[PDB]
Amino acid sequence: GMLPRLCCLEKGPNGYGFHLHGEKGKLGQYIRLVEPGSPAEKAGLLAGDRLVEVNGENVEKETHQQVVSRIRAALNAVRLLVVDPEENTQL
Ligand SMILES: [Cl-]
Ligand SMILES: [Cl-]
Ligand SMILES: [Cl-]
Ligand SMILES: [Cl-]
Ligand code: NI
């Protein structure tokens, strides 16, 4: 498809089932460690994906702490717009 993947997750008993990872001295948060059978896997989330939006707000330039806050503070559901960094670039 041509639209970025939009992963819509409902929180389970063990959370969403993925980790969020940031680099050194460079903006960007990425998906890691997607648990098998989790809401994250069922929604199509993949390790290595760059997180572009959370619940309709752009997080490409935000700190790790801000993005976690935006994912968490939400009410047991989150919509994550993600892209393959290999094939996608913000200009
Ligand atoms: Cl690390
Ligand atoms: Cl990973
Ligand atoms: Cl979103
Ligand atoms: Cl980029
Ligand atoms: Ni890139």
UniProtKB/Swiss-Prot annotation:
Modifications made to the protein after synthesis: Phosphorylated on serine residues.
In-chain residues carrying the UniProt-annotated modification Phosphoserine: 38
Domain PDZ span(s) in chain numbering: 6-86
Induction: By estrogen.
Tissue: Detected in liver, kidney, pancreas, prostate, spleen, small intestine and placenta, in particular in the syncytiotrophoblast.
Primary role: Scaffold protein that connects plasma membrane proteins with members of the ezrin/moesin/radixin family and thereby helps to link them to the actin cytoskeleton and to regulate their surface expression. Necessary for recycling of internalized ADRB2. Was first known to play a role in the regulation of the activity and subcellular location of SLC9A3. Necessary for cAMP-mediated phosphorylation and inhibition of SLC9A3. May enhance Wnt signaling. May participate in HTR4 targeting to microvilli. Involved in the regulation of phosphate reabsorption in the renal proximal tubules.
Name listed for the protein in its UniProt record: Na(+)/H(+) exchange regulatory cofactor NHE-RF1
